[PDB]
């Protein structure tokens, strides 16, 4: 329970053991659960002294204490991480990665992870200082099980922030340098190492389809689908996001997902008690129904159409909106027989009930989907039959009411619907 005054006196004492004790006291201060005095320590000028202590190879305890203290300062706001980087901490922590003491190199891994996790700019600043080579070198073991559990989780967590934060995305030469280690961690049997690895994959799969292909060419889609069925929600969440990111690319990447068996887990994901899992699974479905007709057929053959109908009927509103997108994409690219099957599953009634929604976008998407279905009924000539189906579930009241409000495309499409199929 030292004061900041006493810590500064100790650090300025120019006695190596007094400095250690003061640094230990600073660690204990920045270690408490109640609000630490981070800005107080920053303002005192202690960060350059801590950074210089990182290089006292003779006194390993003061290396450890400074690393810990600096780690906790870097764990806070972006201004506080900035202060740590401004003290020269990045190259010194990279030098400490090679410490012969496991807890000190672990602390340097933690610190570099905190620094890189602040955003794009510090992430590439760490990469330019050459952290990636010794970071991966700490995993150059035949069997990852011989490593200490916390050591491995910290390395995985730091690797994931090195893959994190788009605009701009991580450099390609760095992603290729990390990816084989990332795959090896994705097969490792530790629930938290698996979570962080899937997070890293999900970070790498968010963006243009070149990056998606870069991840898929390493063959991780099977492992991602396997993890999709895990019992740990912290694992399933990032797996589902990486899967959802992968099915935003070419139809060939979507296929490579489907072939792995991903559609078989979706009956669970579309009935998951966690709203966010439902939303992510429905969004993934919508990007699959925007694919080729045989892919829509794969969705049908797994009986997922009744689950989409269920998600459109009773779900969180965001999930319903995602389901509406899925149905519009299905009706947009589906064979006439497939739209028949979608209507035979009961899609019309919840589709009408959501016209009374308070969201302009969802209404546009639903009305657009109705245009698709009517276009399919014209090809079959059964336009009046669908007309009366929309009659019996109270749809035509909602189209006539909607044919007149703020947005332009809404009244345009809905007036087109009235004047073409109800007269």
């Amino acid at each position: 329970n030292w004061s900041v005054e006493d810590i500064v006196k100790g650090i300025n004492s120019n006695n190596l053991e007094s400095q250690l004790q003061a640094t230990q006291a600073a660690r204990k201060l920045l270690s408490r659960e109640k609000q630490p005095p981070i800005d107080n320590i920053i303002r005192a000028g202690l960060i350059p002294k801590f950074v210089s202590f990182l290089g006292k190879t003779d006194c390993s305890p003061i290396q450890f204490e400074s690393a810990w203290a600096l780690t906790n300062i870097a764990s806070g706001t972006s201004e506080q991480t900035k202060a740590v980087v401004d003290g020269g901490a990045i190259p010194a922590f990279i030098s400490l990665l090679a410490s012969p003491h496991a807890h000190i190199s672990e602390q340097a891994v933690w610190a570099l992870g905190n620094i890189a996790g602040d955003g794009s700019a510090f992430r590439d600043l760490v990469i330019k200082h050459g952290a990636i080579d010794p970071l991966l070198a700490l995993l150059a073991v035949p069997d990852l099980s011989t490593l200490a559990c916390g050591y491995l989780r910290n390395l995985t967590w730091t690797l994931s922030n090195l893959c994190r934060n788009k605009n701009p995305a991580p450099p390609l030469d760095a992603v290729e340098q990390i990816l084989p280690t990332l795959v090896r961690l994705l097969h490792h049997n530790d629930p938290e190492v698996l979570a962080d690895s899937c997070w890293a994959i999900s970070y790498l799969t968010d963006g243009p389809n070149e990056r998606i292909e870069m991840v898929v060419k390493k063959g991780v889609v099977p492992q991602l689908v396997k993890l999709l069925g895990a019992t740990e929600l912290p694992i399933v969440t990032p797996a589902l996001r990486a899967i959802g990111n992968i099915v935003t690319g070419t139809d060939e990447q979507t296929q490579k997902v489907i072939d792995a068996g991903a559609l078989a887990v979706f009956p669970s994901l579309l009935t998951n008690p966690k709203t966010n899992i439902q939303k992510e699974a429905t969004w993934t479905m919508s990007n699959i129904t925007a694919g080729r007709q045989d892919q829509i057929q794969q969705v049908v053959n797994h009986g997922l159409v009744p689950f989409l109908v269920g998600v459109l009927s009773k779900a969180d509103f965001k999930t319903q909106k995602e389901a509406a997108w899925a149905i519009t994409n299905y009706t947009s690219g589906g064979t006439v027989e497939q739209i028949v099957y979608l209507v035979h599953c009961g899609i019309i009634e919840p589709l009408m009930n959501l016209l009374s929604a308070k969201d302009t976008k969802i209404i546009q998407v639903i009305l657009d989907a109705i245009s698709n279905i009517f276009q399919a009924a014209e090809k079959l000539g059964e336009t009046e039959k669908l007309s009366i189906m929309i009659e019996e579930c109270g749809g035509l009241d909602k189209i006539e009411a909607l044919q007149r409000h703020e947005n332009e495309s809404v009244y345009k499409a809905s007036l087109n619907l009235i004047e073409k199929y109800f007269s």
Partner: peptide, 8 residues
């Protein structure tokens, strides 16, 4: 999730 403090 984006940063971590070591709380002893």
């Amino acid at each position: 999730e984006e940063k971590r403090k070591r709380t002893y």
